[PDB]
Amino acid sequence: MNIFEMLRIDEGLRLKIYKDTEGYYTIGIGHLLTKSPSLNAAKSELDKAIGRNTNGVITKDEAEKLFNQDVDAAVRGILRNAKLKPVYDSLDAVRRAALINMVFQMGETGVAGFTNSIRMLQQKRWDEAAVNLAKSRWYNQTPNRAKRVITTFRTGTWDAYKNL
Numbered sequence: 001m002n003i004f005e006m007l008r009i010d011e012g013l014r015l016k017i018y019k020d021t022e023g024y025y026t027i028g029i030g031h032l033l034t035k036s037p038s039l040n041a042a043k044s045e046l047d048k049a050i051g052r053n054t055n056g057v058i059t060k061d062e063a064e065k066l067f068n069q070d071v072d073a074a075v076r077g078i079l080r081n082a083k084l085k086p087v088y089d090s091l092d093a094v095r096r097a098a099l100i101n102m103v104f105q106m107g108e109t110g111v112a113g114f115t116n117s118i119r120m121l122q123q124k125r126w127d128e129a130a131v132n133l134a135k136s137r138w139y140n141q142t143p144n145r146a147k148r149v150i151t152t153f154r155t156g157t158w159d160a161y162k163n164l
């Protein structure tokens with residue numbers, strides 16, 4: 001298990017433009033295209049992202065490419081964000097992964113507002129953090145995935161992704 005396989009499990013792989021859980025145009029391995037209700041718009045973002053006129057369909061290879069970019073960018077944002085870098089640095093590898101997961105899913109900003117959980121994480125109060133993490137829109141809207149991530153933080157193990 002690693003961040004890529006983890007996210008691969010949580011986001012799936014689809015080669016045609018589709019709507020995410022929030023109703024937004026996305027493709028590949030959770031590659032958000034736009035929050036725009038316009039499919040044409042999404043298609044435009046896709047061609048720009050890929051470098052060719054795709055007509056909303058991409059190859060596995062292509063999906064993976066945006067995936068790698070997305071993961072990297074997530075990590076890169078974490079390091080550049082003052083509200084996140086410290087907790088990230090304080091964590092072991094597994095937990096770091098759960099943080100990347102979150103940021104890939106809800107953007108750096110959303111994650112940074114998890115002030116209290118962040119603080120608990122930093123203090124290494126695993127159980128406490130986990131309960132606090134669940135008191136969120138995030139958990140309510142995507143509870144199964146959230147439970148996985150939370151478990152990851154609480155235990156520092158990949159148990160939640162163990163048989164997926």
Ligand SMILES: [Cl-]
Nearest residue numbers: 048049066069
């Ligand atoms: Cl992109």
Ligand SMILES: [Cl-]
Nearest residue numbers: 142143144145
């Ligand atoms: Cl879910």
Ligand SMILES: [K+]
Nearest residue numbers: 011012020030
């Ligand atoms: K998805």
